[PDB]
Amino acid sequence: GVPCRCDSDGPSVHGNTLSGTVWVGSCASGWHKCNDEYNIAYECCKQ
Structure with missing residues (x-):
């Protein structure tokens, strides 16, 4: 994997x-979209 933030990463x-x-x-088998976009090629998710 690679480290990647979400739409509301936490500005404050x-x-x-x-x-x-x-x-x-595409994403991992137990995670979901933490944003509307994903990546260049890839996809960012959270858990």
């Missing part, structure tokens, strides 16, 4: 770091 809140992850090709 705790734990705002890359706790989300990009899965290229």
Whole structure:
């Protein structure tokens, strides 16, 4: 995977770091879209 943020990463809140992850090709089997967009090629999701 790769570290990748969400739509509401946390501009003024705790734990705002890359706790989300990009899965290229498409997402991981237990995660979901944390944003409307995804990536260049890939897709960002959270858990």
